[PDB]
Amino acid sequence: AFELPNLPYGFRALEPHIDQQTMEIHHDKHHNTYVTKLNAAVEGTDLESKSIEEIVANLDSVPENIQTAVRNNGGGHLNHSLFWELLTPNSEEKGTVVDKIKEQWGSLDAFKEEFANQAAARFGSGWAWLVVNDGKLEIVTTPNQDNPLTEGKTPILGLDVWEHAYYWKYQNKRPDYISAFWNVVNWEKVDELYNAA
Amino acid sequence: AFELPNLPYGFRALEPHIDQQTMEIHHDKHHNTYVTKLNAAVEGTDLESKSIEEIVANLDSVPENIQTAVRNNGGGHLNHSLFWELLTPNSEEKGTVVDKIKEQWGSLDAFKEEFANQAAARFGSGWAWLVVNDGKLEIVTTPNQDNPLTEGKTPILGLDVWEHAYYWKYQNKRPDYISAFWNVVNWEKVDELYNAAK
Ligand SMILES: [Mn+2]
Ligand SMILES: [Mn+2]
């Protein structure tokens, strides 16, 4: 059954951009809760055999009695699993995806600008994503723990913009959190998820 | 000319149920942002001077150039305006609505169990409500800053279950925040909202 994956770095590795208090509570309480509630919904069903990607890609096929719980807690597991890996203490703005971004948006900054506007515009709880749609790049956001895989789009970069992702250090200033984020993006992992799609 | 309302008590009045840090930033920054953005959104229109209740009950009528901004910021202004007046340091579990609740749910704490279960279950950002629906009591939750007035139900009690409302004191444990809330409910304001409804 699903386990809370360890972070690939220590709680403090992403300072000063993401504070150790938030990394610890966000990983060990919030993500752990999604794993517990996901397990309680799937265990004793034929969902036990499927990857989270498989489940989230096909939420409409899930039996209605557990669909909401699998949508919310399944989305939660997948989103944070992606997120912990898309962060690094050794961010470098180079690679296959950084190059695709400059051809399409005209520069990395212009892309960041549009990502930031959508990320900030996401009202309430949700995620800002870079996706592949029909082999093209697209900036989308989703509400709560919805994931663009449910709409057949492949996520290659994600930002958590639930208040719990930035309240400790940035309180009500989501745009400053979005700015700090660029400093910790694992562009190696963005390339790997793109090269998969 | 929409305005951030004053708190009718101090930032410490709701301790230890809601912390002074939260009361201060929730009102002074979060609510203030809704009021500022609402005033900006409605500039030049008949919305400038309408009651926020009328506006939110008639979101369908709002021109599409500003509908989302007024849904989000107008609802944030109404919701928080109601919320500050529905909290008090002198909560007493009595009156017209407590009596109707005991008739309908059997007791007040049985009602709290149902309210607490729906308020816990509202996934992501939102509100838990007690509403008047065609003269009857109903518990409902809404997403984000959506308000039951839009669906023709009058809110008489509300609880903010956005993470900002409880994160400083309770972190992930929204149920512990929901239990503390009962200690600071202004049942006199609930009765007044009920009577304005009926
Ligand atoms: Mn999160
Ligand atoms: Mn609030």
Tell me which residue in B125, B167, B171 faces A125 most closely, judged by beta carbons.
B125
Last residue in a domain, options A86, A109, A126:
A86
Instruction: Find out whether A143 and B72 touch, Cβ atoms under 8 Å.
Output: no
User: In 3-state terms, what secondary structure has residue A159?
Assistant: strand
How far, in Å, CA of A82 to CA of A149, rounded?
A: 12
Q: Cα–chain-centroid distance for residue A13?
A: 18
Q: Other C-beta atoms within 10 Å of A32: how many?
A: 15
Cα of A17 vs centre of ligand 2, distance in Å, is 25
- Looking at the fold, whether B44 and B117 belong to one and the same domain comes out as no
Q: Other C-beta atoms within 10 Å of B171: how many?
A: 19
B124 chain-A contacts, CB cut-off 8 A: 124-126, 143-145, 162
User: What secondary structure letter does DSSP report for A157?
Assistant: E
Rounded alpha-carbon distances, angstroms, from residue A50 to A76, A126, B188: 16, 25, 53
Which residue is associated with the tokens 């990395």? A108
- Looking at the fold, whether A110 and A177 belong to one and the same domain comes out as yes
**B143 with A124: Cβ contact below 8 A:** yes
Please write down the long-range contacts of A128-136, taking CB distance under 8 Å and 24 or more positions apart.
A128/A158, A128/A159, A128/A161, A128/A178, A129/A153, A129/A155, A129/A157, A129/A158, A129/A159, A130/A97, A130/A155, A130/A156, A130/A157, A130/A190, A131/A155, A131/A156, A132/A156, A132/A194, A132/A197, A135/A197
One-letter identity of residue A182: W
Which residues, including other chains, have CB under 8 Å from residue A135's CB and lie 6 or more apart? A197
- Looking at the fold, whether B143 and B119 belong to one and the same domain comes out as yes
- Looking at the fold, whether A104 and A166 belong to one and the same domain comes out as yes
Q: Other C-beta atoms within 10 Å of B187: how many?
A: 21
Report how this structure was experimentally obtained: X-ray
Query: How far off is chain A from B53, nearest CA to CA, in Å?
Result: 21
B101: nearest Cα among B176, B177, B180, B156: B156
Q: Is residue B47 part of a domain?
A: yes
Q: Is residue B166 part of a domain?
A: yes
Last residue in a domain, options A49, A67, A86:
A86
Tell me which residue in B30, B72, B172 faces A29 most closely, judged by beta carbons.
B172
* Backbone phi and psi for residue B161, each to the nearest 5 degrees, phi listed first: -110, 25
Q: What number of C-beta contacts closer than 8 Å exist between A and B? A: 52
Instruction: Find out whether B166 and B177 touch, Cβ atoms under 8 Å.
Output: yes
Rounded alpha-carbon distances, angstroms, from residue B158 to B87, B104, B162, B172: 10, 19, 12, 20
User: What secondary structure letter does DSSP report for A177?
Assistant: H
How far, in Å, CA of B114 to CA of B57, rounded?
A: 26
Q: Is residue B10 part of a domain?
A: no
How far, in Å, CA of B136 to CA of B159, rounded?
A: 19
Which residue is associated with the tokens 């500003």? B66
Last residue in a domain, options A86, A110, A129:
A86
Beta bridge partners of A143: A126
Query: How far off is chain B from A124, nearest CA to CA, in Å?
Result: 5
Structure tokens given for B166: 């409880």
Instruction: Find out whether A108 and A102 touch, Cβ atoms under 8 Å.
Output: yes
Q: What is the DSSP string of chain B?
A: ----PPPSS-TTTTTTTS-HHHHHHIIIIIIHHHHHHHHHHHTTSGGGGS-HHHHHHTGGGS-TTTHHHIIIIIHHHHHHHHHHHHB-SS--S-SHHHHHHHHHHSSHHHHHHHHHHHHHH--SSEEEEEEEETTEEEEEEEETT--GGGGT-EEEEEEE-SGGGTHHHHTT-HHHHHHHHGGGB-HHHHHHHHHHH-
- Looking at the fold, whether A68 and A109 belong to one and the same domain comes out as no
- CATH number, domain at A164? 3.55.40.20
How far, in Å, CA of B113 to CA of B185, rounded?
A: 15
Question: Is the N-terminal amide bond of A143 cis, ω within 30° of 0?
Answer: no
- Looking at the fold, whether B122 and B174 belong to one and the same domain comes out as yes
B99: nearest Cα among B82, B87, B91, B111: B111
One-letter identity of residue B61: S
One-letter identity of residue B19: D
Instruction: Find out whether B42 and B70 touch, Cβ atoms under 8 Å.
Output: yes
Domain that holds residue A115: 96-196
- Looking at the fold, whether A101 and A191 belong to one and the same domain comes out as yes
Instruction: Find out whether A95 and A187 touch, Cβ atoms under 8 Å.
Output: yes
- Distance between first and last Cα of chain A: 25
Interior/surface letters B4-38, b for 16+ CB within 10 angstroms, e for the rest: beebebebebbeebbbeebbebbbeebbeebbebb
- Looking at the fold, whether B154 and B68 belong to one and the same domain comes out as no
- Residue A30 annotated as binding site: no
Q: Residues A99, A101, A103, A107: what is their CA dihedral angle, to the nearest 10 degrees?
A: -100
- CATH number, domain at A60? 1.10.287.990
Which residues, including other chains, have CB under 8 Å from residue B42's CB and lie 6 or more apart? B2, B48, B55, B66, B70, B74
How far, in Å, CA of A27 to CA of A12, rounded?
A: 13
- Looking at the fold, whether B63 and B150 belong to one and the same domain comes out as no
Q: Which residues of B are annotated as a binding site for Mn(2+)?
A: 26, 80, 160, 164
Q: Is residue A15 part of a domain?
A: no
A121 chain-B contacts, CB cut-off 8 A: none
- Looking at the fold, whether B109 and B35 belong to one and the same domain comes out as no
Which residues, including other chains, have CB under 8 Å from residue A8's CB and lie 6 or more apart? A84, A85, A88
- Looking at the fold, whether A30 and A105 belong to one and the same domain comes out as no
Q: How many domains does chain A have?
A: 2
Q: Please work out, in degrees rounded to the nearest 5, the angle formed at the alpha carbon of residue A114 by the alpha carbons of A116 and A20.
A: 25
How far, in Å, CA of B154 to CA of B53, rounded?
A: 10
Cα of B76 vs centre of ligand 2, distance in Å, is 7
Which residue is associated with the tokens 């992501």? B124
Q: Other C-beta atoms within 10 Å of B92: how many?
A: 11
- Looking at the fold, whether B70 and B139 belong to one and the same domain comes out as no
Rounded alpha-carbon distances, angstroms, from residue A139 to A43, A93, A157, B30: 35, 18, 9, 27
User: In 3-state terms, what secondary structure has residue A106?
Assistant: coil
